[PDB]
Coordinates of C-alpha atoms in Angstrom, one line a residue:
Chain A
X806 CA -17.6 50.6 33.4
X807 CA -13.9 50.4 32.6
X808 CA -15.5 52.9 30.2
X809 CA -17.3 55.0 32.9
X810 CA -14.6 57.8 32.8
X811 CA -14.9 57.9 29.0
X812 CA -18.6 58.9 29.0
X813 CA -19.8 62.3 30.0
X814 CA -23.4 61.0 29.7
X815 CA -25.4 58.2 31.1
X816 CA -28.0 57.9 28.2
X817 CA -28.9 59.5 24.9
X818 CA -32.4 59.8 23.6
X819 CA -33.2 60.1 20.0
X820 CA -36.6 61.2 18.9
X821 CA -38.3 63.8 20.9
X822 CA -42.0 63.4 20.4
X823 CA -44.2 63.1 23.4
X824 CA -42.9 59.7 24.6
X825 CA -39.2 60.4 24.0
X826 CA -39.7 63.9 25.6
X827 CA -41.2 62.4 28.7
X828 CA -38.5 59.7 28.9
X829 CA -35.8 62.3 28.7
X830 CA -37.4 64.6 31.3
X831 CA -37.9 61.7 33.8
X832 CA -34.3 60.6 33.3
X833 CA -33.1 64.2 33.8
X834 CA -35.3 64.5 36.9
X835 CA -33.7 61.3 38.3
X836 CA -30.2 62.7 38.0
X837 CA -29.0 61.1 34.7
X838 CA -26.7 63.1 32.4
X839 CA -28.8 63.0 29.2
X840 CA -27.8 63.8 25.7
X841 CA -30.5 64.2 22.9
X842 CA -30.9 64.6 19.2
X843 CA -33.9 65.3 17.2
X844 CA -35.6 67.4 14.4
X845 CA -37.9 69.3 16.9
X846 CA -37.2 72.9 17.9
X847 CA -40.0 73.1 20.5
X848 CA -39.1 69.7 22.1
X849 CA -35.3 70.1 22.0
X850 CA -35.5 73.6 23.5
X851 CA -37.4 72.6 26.7
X852 CA -35.1 69.6 27.3
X853 CA -31.9 71.8 26.9
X854 CA -33.5 74.2 29.4
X855 CA -34.1 71.2 31.8
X856 CA -30.4 70.2 31.6
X857 CA -30.1 67.9 28.4
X858 CA -27.1 68.2 26.2
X859 CA -28.1 68.8 22.5
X860 CA -25.9 66.8 20.1
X861 CA -25.2 67.9 16.5
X862 CA -26.0 64.5 15.0
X863 CA -27.3 61.0 15.5
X864 CA -23.7 59.7 15.5
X865 CA -22.7 62.2 18.2
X866 CA -25.6 61.1 20.4
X867 CA -24.7 57.4 19.9
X868 CA -21.1 58.1 20.9
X869 CA -21.9 60.3 23.9
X870 CA -23.5 57.5 26.1
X871 CA -23.2 53.8 26.5
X872 CA -26.9 53.4 25.6
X873 CA -29.2 55.3 23.3
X874 CA -33.0 55.2 23.6
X875 CA -34.8 55.3 20.2
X876 CA -38.4 56.6 20.1
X877 CA -39.2 57.4 16.5
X878 CA -42.2 57.8 14.3
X879 CA -42.0 54.4 12.6
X880 CA -39.8 51.7 11.1
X881 CA -39.0 53.9 8.1
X882 CA -37.7 56.6 10.6
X883 CA -35.6 54.0 12.4
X884 CA -33.8 52.9 9.2
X885 CA -33.3 56.5 8.1
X886 CA -31.6 57.4 11.5
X887 CA -29.4 54.2 11.2
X888 CA -28.4 55.0 7.6
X889 CA -27.1 58.5 8.4
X890 CA -23.4 59.5 7.9
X891 CA -21.0 57.5 10.2
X892 CA -23.8 56.0 12.2
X893 CA -22.8 52.4 11.5
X894 CA -19.4 53.1 13.0
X895 CA -20.9 54.8 16.0
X896 CA -23.1 51.8 16.9
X897 CA -20.0 49.7 17.9
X898 CA -20.1 48.8 21.6
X899 CA -23.4 50.8 22.2
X900 CA -26.8 49.5 23.2
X901 CA -29.8 50.7 21.3
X902 CA -33.0 50.5 23.4
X903 CA -35.8 50.7 20.8
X904 CA -39.3 51.7 22.0
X905 CA -40.5 52.6 18.4
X906 CA -43.6 50.6 17.3
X907 CA -42.6 48.1 14.8
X908 CA -43.9 45.1 12.7
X909 CA -42.9 41.7 14.0
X910 CA -40.4 40.8 11.2
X911 CA -38.9 44.3 11.2
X912 CA -37.3 44.0 14.7
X913 CA -35.2 41.0 13.7
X914 CA -33.8 43.0 10.8
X915 CA -33.0 45.9 13.1
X916 CA -31.4 43.6 15.7
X917 CA -29.3 42.2 12.7
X918 CA -28.3 45.6 11.6
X919 CA -27.2 46.8 15.0
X920 CA -25.4 43.5 15.7
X921 CA -23.7 43.6 12.3
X922 CA -22.2 47.0 13.4
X923 CA -21.0 45.5 16.8
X924 CA -23.7 47.1 18.9
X925 CA -26.4 45.5 21.0
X926 CA -30.1 45.8 20.3
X927 CA -32.8 45.8 23.0
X928 CA -36.5 46.2 22.0
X929 CA -38.7 47.8 24.7
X930 CA -42.5 48.0 25.2
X931 CA -43.7 50.3 27.9
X932 CA -47.0 49.4 29.4
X933 CA -48.0 52.9 30.3
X934 CA -49.3 56.2 29.1
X935 CA -46.7 59.0 29.0
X936 CA -48.1 60.4 32.3
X937 CA -46.9 57.3 34.1
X938 CA -43.4 56.9 32.5
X939 CA -41.1 56.8 35.5
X940 CA -43.9 55.6 37.9
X941 CA -42.8 53.0 40.5
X942 CA -45.9 50.9 39.6
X943 CA -45.5 51.1 35.7
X944 CA -44.4 48.0 33.8
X945 CA -42.2 47.5 30.7
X946 CA -41.2 44.4 28.7
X947 CA -37.8 44.1 27.0
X948 CA -36.4 41.6 24.5
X949 CA -33.5 41.2 22.1
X950 CA -30.0 41.1 23.7
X951 CA -30.3 39.7 27.3
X952 CA -26.8 40.7 28.3
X953 CA -27.2 44.4 27.1
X954 CA -30.6 44.6 28.8
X955 CA -29.0 43.4 32.1
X956 CA -26.2 45.9 31.7
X957 CA -28.7 48.7 31.4
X958 CA -31.5 47.4 33.5
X959 CA -31.2 50.0 36.4
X960 CA -31.3 52.8 33.8
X961 CA -34.4 51.4 32.1
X962 CA -36.0 50.9 35.5
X963 CA -36.0 54.6 35.6
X964 CA -38.7 54.6 33.0
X965 CA -41.0 51.9 34.6
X966 CA -40.4 50.5 38.0
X967 CA -41.1 46.9 37.1
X968 CA -39.5 45.3 34.1
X969 CA -39.2 41.8 32.6
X970 CA -37.0 40.4 29.9
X971 CA -38.5 37.7 27.7
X972 CA -36.9 36.0 24.6
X973 CA -38.0 37.4 21.3
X974 CA -41.0 35.3 20.4
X975 CA -42.4 35.1 23.9
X976 CA -42.0 38.9 24.4
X977 CA -44.0 39.8 21.3
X978 CA -46.7 37.2 22.1
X979 CA -46.9 38.2 25.7
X980 CA -47.2 41.9 24.8
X981 CA -49.9 41.1 22.3
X982 CA -52.2 39.2 24.7
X983 CA -51.4 41.6 27.6
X984 CA -52.6 44.6 25.6
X985 CA -55.6 42.6 24.3
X986 CA -56.7 42.0 27.9
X987 CA -55.9 45.5 29.2
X988 CA -57.6 47.4 26.4
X989 CA -60.6 45.0 26.3
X990 CA -61.1 45.5 30.1
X991 CA -61.2 49.2 29.5
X992 CA -63.7 48.9 26.7
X993 CA -66.0 46.6 28.8
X994 CA -66.1 49.5 31.3
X995 CA -67.0 52.1 28.6
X996 CA -69.7 49.8 27.2
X997 CA -71.3 49.2 30.7
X998 CA -71.2 52.9 31.5
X999 CA -72.7 53.8 28.1
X1000 CA -75.4 51.1 28.7
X1001 CA -76.2 52.8 32.1
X1002 CA -77.1 56.0 30.1
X1003 CA -79.8 54.1 28.2
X1004 CA -81.2 53.2 31.6
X1005 CA -81.3 56.9 32.7
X1006 CA -78.2 56.5 34.8
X1007 CA -76.0 59.5 33.9
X1008 CA -72.5 58.7 32.9
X1009 CA -71.1 61.4 35.2
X1010 CA -72.4 59.9 38.5
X1011 CA -72.5 56.3 37.5
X1012 CA -69.0 55.9 36.3
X1013 CA -67.4 56.4 39.7
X1014 CA -69.9 54.2 41.4
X1015 CA -69.5 51.4 38.8
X1016 CA -65.7 51.4 39.2
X1017 CA -65.7 51.6 43.0
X1018 CA -68.5 48.9 43.4
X1019 CA -66.8 46.4 41.1
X1020 CA -63.0 47.0 41.8
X1021 CA -62.6 44.4 44.6
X1022 CA -64.9 41.8 43.1
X1023 CA -63.1 41.8 39.8
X1024 CA -59.5 41.9 41.3
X1025 CA -60.4 39.1 43.8
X1026 CA -62.0 37.1 40.9
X1027 CA -58.9 37.4 38.6
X1028 CA -56.6 36.5 41.5
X1029 CA -58.6 33.4 42.3
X1030 CA -58.7 32.4 38.6
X1031 CA -54.9 32.7 38.4
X1032 CA -54.6 30.5 41.5
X1033 CA -56.9 27.9 39.9
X1034 CA -55.0 28.1 36.5
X1035 CA -51.7 27.5 38.4
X1036 CA -53.1 24.6 40.4
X1037 CA -55.2 23.3 37.6
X1038 CA -58.1 23.1 40.0
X1039 CA -61.4 23.6 38.2
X1040 CA -63.7 22.0 40.7
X1041 CA -67.1 23.6 40.5
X1042 CA -67.3 24.1 44.2
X1043 CA -67.7 27.8 44.1
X1044 CA -68.5 29.4 40.7
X1045 CA -70.0 27.0 38.2
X1046 CA -69.6 27.9 34.6
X1047 CA -73.2 26.8 33.7
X1048 CA -74.6 29.0 36.5
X1049 CA -72.6 32.0 35.1
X1050 CA -73.9 31.2 31.6
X1051 CA -77.4 31.5 33.1
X1052 CA -76.7 34.8 34.8
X1053 CA -74.9 36.2 31.7
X1054 CA -78.0 35.4 29.5
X1055 CA -80.2 37.2 32.0
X1056 CA -78.0 40.3 32.0
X1057 CA -77.9 40.2 28.1
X1058 CA -81.7 40.0 28.0
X1059 CA -82.3 43.1 30.3
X1060 CA -79.7 44.9 28.2
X1061 CA -81.5 43.9 25.0
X1062 CA -85.0 44.9 26.3
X1063 CA -83.6 48.3 27.1
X1064 CA -82.4 48.6 23.5
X1065 CA -78.7 48.9 24.3
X1066 CA -76.0 47.9 21.9
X1067 CA -73.5 45.7 23.8
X1068 CA -71.4 43.8 21.3
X1069 CA -68.6 43.2 23.8
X1070 CA -71.0 41.6 26.3
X1071 CA -72.7 39.6 23.5
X1072 CA -69.3 38.2 22.7
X1073 CA -68.6 37.4 26.3
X1074 CA -72.0 35.5 26.4
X1075 CA -71.0 33.7 23.2
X1076 CA -67.7 32.5 24.8
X1077 CA -69.3 31.2 28.0
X1078 CA -72.4 29.6 26.3
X1079 CA -69.9 27.9 24.0
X1080 CA -67.7 26.7 26.9
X1081 CA -70.9 25.3 28.4
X1082 CA -71.8 23.5 25.2
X1083 CA -68.3 22.0 25.2
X1084 CA -68.7 20.2 28.6
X1085 CA -67.2 22.8 30.9
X1086 CA -70.5 23.7 32.6
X1087 CA -69.9 22.0 35.9
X1088 CA -66.4 23.4 36.2
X1089 CA -65.2 26.7 37.8
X1090 CA -65.7 29.8 35.6
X1091 CA -61.9 29.9 35.0
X1092 CA -62.3 26.7 32.8
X1093 CA -63.5 29.2 30.2
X1094 CA -59.7 29.5 29.6
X1095 CA -59.5 25.9 28.5
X1096 CA -62.3 26.4 25.9
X1097 CA -59.8 28.4 23.8
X1098 CA -57.3 25.4 23.6
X1099 CA -56.3 23.7 20.4
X1100 CA -56.2 20.4 22.2
Chain B
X1458 CA -90.4 53.5 72.4
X1459 CA -94.2 52.9 72.1
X1460 CA -93.6 49.4 70.7
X1461 CA -91.1 48.1 73.4
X1462 CA -91.2 44.7 71.6
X1463 CA -88.8 42.2 72.9
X1464 CA -86.4 40.3 70.6
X1465 CA -84.0 37.4 71.6
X1466 CA -82.4 37.5 68.2
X1467 CA -80.8 40.1 66.0
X1468 CA -81.7 38.4 62.7
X1469 CA -83.4 35.4 61.2
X1470 CA -82.1 33.6 58.1
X1471 CA -84.5 31.7 55.9
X1472 CA -82.8 29.5 53.4
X1473 CA -79.8 27.5 54.3
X1474 CA -78.3 26.6 50.9
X1475 CA -74.8 27.9 50.1
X1476 CA -75.3 31.6 50.2
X1477 CA -77.8 31.5 53.2
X1478 CA -75.5 29.2 55.1
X1479 CA -72.5 31.5 54.7
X1480 CA -74.5 34.6 55.6
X1481 CA -75.7 32.9 58.8
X1482 CA -72.2 31.6 59.5
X1483 CA -70.6 35.1 59.1
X1484 CA -73.3 36.7 61.2
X1485 CA -72.8 34.2 64.0
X1486 CA -69.0 34.7 63.9
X1487 CA -69.6 38.4 64.3
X1488 CA -71.5 37.8 67.5
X1489 CA -75.1 38.2 66.1
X1490 CA -77.8 36.1 67.8
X1491 CA -79.1 34.3 64.7
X1492 CA -82.4 32.3 64.3
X1493 CA -82.7 30.1 61.2
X1494 CA -85.3 28.0 59.4
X1495 CA -84.8 25.6 56.4
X1496 CA -87.1 23.3 54.6
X1497 CA -84.5 20.6 55.4
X1498 CA -83.5 20.5 59.2
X1499 CA -80.4 18.6 57.9
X1500 CA -78.5 21.8 56.7
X1501 CA -79.2 23.5 60.0
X1502 CA -77.1 21.0 61.8
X1503 CA -73.7 22.7 61.6
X1504 CA -75.3 26.1 62.1
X1505 CA -77.0 24.9 65.2
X1506 CA -73.7 23.5 66.5
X1507 CA -72.2 27.0 65.6
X1508 CA -74.9 28.5 67.9
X1509 CA -77.8 29.4 65.6
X1510 CA -81.3 28.8 67.0
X1511 CA -83.4 26.4 65.0
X1512 CA -87.0 27.8 64.5
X1513 CA -89.9 25.4 64.2
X1514 CA -91.5 27.3 61.2
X1515 CA -91.2 30.4 58.9
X1516 CA -93.7 32.1 61.2
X1517 CA -91.5 31.6 64.3
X1518 CA -88.4 32.8 62.5
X1519 CA -90.2 36.0 61.4
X1520 CA -91.4 36.7 64.9
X1521 CA -88.1 36.0 66.5
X1522 CA -86.0 38.8 65.1
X1523 CA -86.7 42.4 63.8
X1524 CA -85.5 41.5 60.3
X1525 CA -85.4 38.2 58.4
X1526 CA -83.0 37.6 55.5
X1527 CA -84.5 35.4 52.7
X1528 CA -82.0 33.5 50.5
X1529 CA -84.0 30.9 48.6
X1530 CA -83.6 28.7 45.6
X1531 CA -85.8 30.8 43.3
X1532 CA -88.9 33.0 43.0
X1533 CA -91.2 30.0 43.4
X1534 CA -89.4 29.0 46.6
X1535 CA -90.1 32.6 48.0
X1536 CA -93.8 32.4 47.3
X1537 CA -94.0 28.9 48.7
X1538 CA -92.4 30.2 51.9
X1539 CA -94.7 33.3 52.0
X1540 CA -97.8 31.1 51.6
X1541 CA -97.0 28.8 54.5
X1542 CA -99.4 28.8 57.5
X1543 CA -99.5 32.1 59.5
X1544 CA -96.7 33.7 57.5
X1545 CA -98.9 36.6 56.1
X1546 CA -99.6 37.7 59.7
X1547 CA -96.1 37.3 60.9
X1548 CA -94.9 39.7 58.2
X1549 CA -96.5 42.7 60.1
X1550 CA -93.9 45.1 61.4
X1551 CA -90.9 43.0 60.2
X1552 CA -88.2 43.9 57.7
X1553 CA -87.7 41.2 55.0
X1554 CA -84.2 41.5 53.3
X1555 CA -84.5 39.5 50.1
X1556 CA -81.3 38.3 48.4
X1557 CA -83.0 35.6 46.3
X1558 CA -82.2 36.1 42.6
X1559 CA -85.4 36.5 40.6
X1560 CA -86.6 38.4 37.5
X1561 CA -87.8 42.0 37.6
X1562 CA -91.4 42.5 38.3
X1563 CA -91.3 39.5 40.5
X1564 CA -89.6 41.7 43.0
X1565 CA -92.3 44.4 42.7
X1566 CA -95.0 41.8 43.5
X1567 CA -93.0 40.4 46.5
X1568 CA -92.6 44.0 47.6
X1569 CA -96.3 44.6 47.2
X1570 CA -97.2 41.4 49.1
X1571 CA -94.9 42.2 52.0
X1572 CA -96.1 45.8 52.1
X1573 CA -99.7 44.8 52.0
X1574 CA -99.1 42.6 55.1
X1575 CA -97.7 45.6 57.0
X1576 CA -94.1 44.5 56.6
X1577 CA -91.2 46.3 55.0
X1578 CA -89.4 44.9 52.0
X1579 CA -85.7 45.4 51.2
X1580 CA -84.2 43.8 48.1
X1581 CA -80.5 43.0 48.4
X1582 CA -77.9 42.2 45.7
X1583 CA -74.5 41.1 47.1
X1584 CA -71.6 41.6 44.8
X1585 CA -69.5 38.8 46.1
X1586 CA -68.7 35.1 45.8
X1587 CA -69.7 33.3 49.0
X1588 CA -66.0 33.2 50.1
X1589 CA -66.2 37.0 50.4
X1590 CA -69.5 37.4 52.3
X1591 CA -68.5 39.3 55.4
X1592 CA -65.5 40.9 53.8
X1593 CA -64.9 44.5 54.7
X1594 CA -64.2 45.3 51.0
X1595 CA -67.3 43.4 49.6
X1596 CA -70.1 45.6 48.3
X1597 CA -73.9 45.1 48.3
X1598 CA -76.7 47.0 46.7
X1599 CA -80.1 47.5 48.3
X1600 CA -83.5 48.9 47.2
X1601 CA -87.2 48.8 48.3
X1602 CA -87.9 50.4 51.7
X1603 CA -85.4 53.1 52.4
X1604 CA -86.4 53.6 56.0
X1605 CA -86.2 49.9 56.8
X1606 CA -82.8 49.6 55.0
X1607 CA -81.4 52.5 57.2
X1608 CA -82.8 50.9 60.3
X1609 CA -81.0 47.6 59.6
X1610 CA -77.9 49.0 57.7
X1611 CA -75.4 48.1 60.4
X1612 CA -76.7 44.5 60.4
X1613 CA -76.5 44.3 56.6
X1614 CA -72.9 45.7 56.7
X1615 CA -72.0 42.5 58.5
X1616 CA -72.5 40.8 55.1
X1617 CA -70.6 43.3 53.0
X1618 CA -68.6 46.2 54.4
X1619 CA -69.8 48.7 51.8
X1620 CA -73.4 49.1 50.9
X1621 CA -75.5 51.5 48.8
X1622 CA -79.3 52.1 48.7
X1623 CA -80.7 53.1 45.2
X1624 CA -84.4 53.7 44.3
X1625 CA -86.0 50.7 42.6
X1626 CA -85.5 51.9 39.0
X1627 CA -81.8 52.8 39.6
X1628 CA -80.8 49.7 41.7
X1629 CA -81.7 47.0 39.3
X1630 CA -80.4 48.9 36.2
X1631 CA -77.1 49.6 38.1
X1632 CA -76.7 46.0 39.2
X1633 CA -77.2 44.9 35.6
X1634 CA -74.5 47.2 34.2
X1635 CA -72.1 46.6 37.1
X1636 CA -72.2 42.8 36.5
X1637 CA -72.0 43.2 32.7
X1638 CA -68.7 45.1 33.2
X1639 CA -67.4 42.8 36.1
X1640 CA -68.1 39.5 34.3
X1641 CA -67.0 40.8 30.9
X1642 CA -63.6 42.0 32.4
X1643 CA -63.1 38.4 33.8
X1644 CA -63.8 36.8 30.4
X1645 CA -61.4 39.3 28.6
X1646 CA -58.8 37.9 31.0
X1647 CA -59.7 34.2 30.2
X1648 CA -59.6 34.9 26.4
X1649 CA -56.2 36.6 26.7
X1650 CA -54.7 33.7 28.7
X1651 CA -56.2 31.2 26.3
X1652 CA -54.7 33.3 23.4
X1653 CA -51.3 33.1 25.2
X1654 CA -51.6 29.4 25.4
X1655 CA -51.9 29.2 21.6
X1656 CA -48.7 31.3 21.3
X1657 CA -46.9 28.6 23.3
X1658 CA -47.0 30.6 26.6
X1659 CA -47.8 28.2 29.4
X1660 CA -50.9 29.0 31.4
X1661 CA -49.0 28.1 34.7
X1662 CA -46.7 31.3 34.5
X1663 CA -48.5 33.4 32.0
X1664 CA -51.8 34.0 33.8
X1665 CA -50.0 35.4 36.8
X1666 CA -47.6 37.6 34.7
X1667 CA -50.5 38.9 32.7
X1668 CA -52.5 39.9 35.8
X1669 CA -49.5 41.5 37.6
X1670 CA -48.2 43.3 34.5
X1671 CA -51.6 44.8 33.6
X1672 CA -53.1 45.6 37.1
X1673 CA -51.9 49.1 37.5
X1674 CA -52.1 50.2 33.9
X1675 CA -55.8 49.1 33.8
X1676 CA -56.7 50.5 37.3
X1677 CA -55.0 53.8 36.4
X1678 CA -56.7 54.0 33.0
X1679 CA -60.2 53.4 34.5
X1680 CA -59.6 56.0 37.3
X1681 CA -58.6 58.6 34.6
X1682 CA -61.6 57.7 32.4
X1683 CA -63.9 58.3 35.4
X1684 CA -62.2 61.7 36.0
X1685 CA -62.8 62.5 32.4
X1686 CA -66.5 61.3 32.4
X1687 CA -67.2 63.3 35.6
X1688 CA -65.5 66.4 34.3
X1689 CA -66.8 66.0 30.7
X1690 CA -63.3 66.4 29.4
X1691 CA -62.7 64.5 26.2
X1692 CA -59.7 66.4 24.9
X1693 CA -57.3 64.2 22.9
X1694 CA -54.3 65.4 24.7
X1695 CA -53.3 62.2 26.4
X1696 CA -55.0 59.1 24.8
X1697 CA -56.5 59.6 21.4
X1698 CA -59.2 57.3 20.2
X1699 CA -57.7 57.2 16.7
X1700 CA -54.3 56.1 18.0
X1701 CA -56.0 53.4 20.1
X1702 CA -57.9 52.2 17.0
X1703 CA -54.6 51.7 15.1
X1704 CA -53.1 50.0 18.2
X1705 CA -56.1 47.7 18.5
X1706 CA -55.9 46.8 14.7
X1707 CA -52.4 45.7 15.0
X1708 CA -53.2 43.5 18.1
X1709 CA -56.2 41.9 16.2
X1710 CA -53.9 41.3 13.2
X1711 CA -51.4 39.4 15.4
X1712 CA -54.2 37.4 17.0
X1713 CA -55.9 36.6 13.7
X1714 CA -52.5 35.6 12.2
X1715 CA -51.7 33.1 14.9
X1716 CA -55.2 31.8 14.3
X1717 CA -56.6 32.4 17.8
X1718 CA -60.3 32.8 18.4
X1719 CA -60.7 36.2 20.2
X1720 CA -64.4 37.1 19.9
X1721 CA -64.3 39.6 22.8
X1722 CA -61.3 41.5 21.6
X1723 CA -62.8 41.4 18.0
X1724 CA -65.9 43.1 19.5
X1725 CA -63.7 45.6 21.3
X1726 CA -62.1 46.5 17.9
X1727 CA -65.6 46.9 16.4
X1728 CA -66.6 49.3 19.1
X1729 CA -63.5 51.5 18.9
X1730 CA -63.6 51.5 15.0
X1731 CA -67.2 52.7 15.1
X1732 CA -66.3 55.5 17.5
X1733 CA -63.6 56.5 15.0
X1734 CA -66.2 56.4 12.2
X1735 CA -68.5 58.5 14.2
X1736 CA -65.8 61.2 14.4
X1737 CA -64.6 60.7 18.0
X1738 CA -61.1 59.9 16.6
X1739 CA -59.4 63.0 18.0
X1740 CA -61.0 62.6 21.4
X1741 CA -59.8 60.8 24.5
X1742 CA -60.4 57.0 24.5
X1743 CA -63.1 57.5 27.2
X1744 CA -65.3 59.2 24.5
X1745 CA -65.9 55.6 23.5
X1746 CA -68.6 55.8 26.1
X1747 CA -70.6 58.3 24.1
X1748 CA -70.8 56.0 21.0
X1749 CA -73.2 53.9 23.0
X1750 CA -75.8 56.7 23.6

């Protein structure tokens, strides 16, 4: 900020594959002065046409802006970029925001490297498909250097309207279980729709009805489960676990009689039957949560 | 206009356990004139105080209103009611809306029995917990007698603001797949929160964050999937099945490493891998759907 006059750019983006390309476009559309570097003729040309400044090198892109967003093929690609001529020197006093998919140990080594050079390392996860980068309702998770993340938070909010910083080990864990739920929820939908087909319900009319008829019920059920988990109130006043176990077995049986393969639903039945066998039968269905506990 | 039959009530409710009680309560609150009957006069007490009329018998309840809602303990309870004195005759020219959960082919017999007596049978499935009976956004499914359903649709919309009639075959099959998804999606959430707890993330903050952070992503992804399934467009332009399989493997690897039990996610992985093995890898993730055909 004392450095504001020194920078002709707000942000640099390195790597212009689909995700990096959309991030750069969104940021240009929002009015940021964006500098880029890549190895991609197609991708760099459209971005230049849209107002991005093409830099001659990684080191120039790092120098051009107070933060550089990295979106690269893999960890090998990240280290290669960082090893290039004069890059170490150009990291000093810059924040790297790393959206590249990474193994858990690898991030700490990258953080170390960037820090060793006097830069700041932020790891980002964007909970969105490229089409929703920049969306007011999209979410991201960031970890690494809290101070650098706060410095650049408004910028990064350009990529996903809602963001949260968590410390390293919580961020990775949270992203893991968040994506397990989000992707599993999608697949339960594919499985039920596919199962509809075996009943003679065509996927093309049934999918929209299935979504529209379940939307409120599921959302209201999850919201209520959260309220109970927060209050630790598992009273079986409304939705007994054992009653659900009964219902689930009935559903699984009609599915089996029709000859449908529903491994996800079978697994769901396994979980709740087991919670029932563990003493949770007379509690609210949200007590299923506790059946996973170590204690 | 030929009939000109006089009713002092809009609806009768037989069965005053939890679901019947709430349905009667909601209908009274909306201003319906409601007649009730229960094997135990006890549970009618609050309903009577609320303004329900207590009928002497099932026969009187059936005669009192143009349609009678049945919400009984089980299929045996329904037959026991229908075999009580004079009930057969009192079925004639009445609509029975049966929300009692039973097994298929029970329903068909119930239907037959009611139709034989000159009555009209409508089966109902309400996709709600009791707390959301009456809710404008609650949904119900109906089948049986289409004509009778349409006759009483506005009354049945008192219980769930959105309703759909499907023919017998479709209705029950649709209810089954709808609940399979709905209940499985809930359990995926419990499994993920439980997993979080084993990473040291407190349930007290994590459940809320998990819901809030995934809501839009999931809802948008399901909307897009439906668009694709309607339009038969499986091009791998935005969300490749193969890239998802890699992503899911990595998630499974972190879960299995922390030593958490995630049987539902495990099964999800198994589904997607299979779809990749079947050659859908380059297709949109919604192609997963086809792997079940």
